[PDB]
């Protein structure tokens, strides 16, 4: 003849979360940049024998 409870009291849990993040960066760009491909010498010949 016994009856159950409507529900059961459960234990309550607290959650504490920490997220920590650090980013660092350095960027350098220094010097002199020259050309690497330049025109070279040329030669041409042309004649009319007849």
């Amino acid at each position: 003849l016994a009856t159950p409870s409507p529900f059961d009291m459960e234990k309550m849990v607290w959650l504490d979360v920490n997220i920590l993040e650090i980013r660092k960066s350095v960027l350098e760009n220094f010097g002199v940049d020259w050309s690497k491909q330049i025109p070279g010498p040329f030669a041409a010949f042309g004649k009319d024998f007849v």
Binding site: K36, Q37, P39, G40, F45, G46, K47
Partner: protein, 51 residues
């Protein structure tokens, strides 16, 4: 008419270059025996894919 008209052309190259790159990645994880753990440190990019 008998003859010829011809010549040559040229280019000069003196290019020189180096490159070095280093990296270490040290992820760490915790998980229980019989469980699974996933970890992602990075990002997401959008991709246009469809059926």
């Amino acid at each position: 008419n008998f003859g010829i008209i011809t010549g040559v052309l040229s280019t000069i190259n003196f290019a020189l270059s180096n490159g070095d790159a280093y990296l270490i990645a040290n992820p760490q994880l915790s998980a229980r025996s019989g469980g699974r753990t996933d970890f992602l440190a990075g990002g997401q990019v959008p991709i246009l894919q469809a059926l």
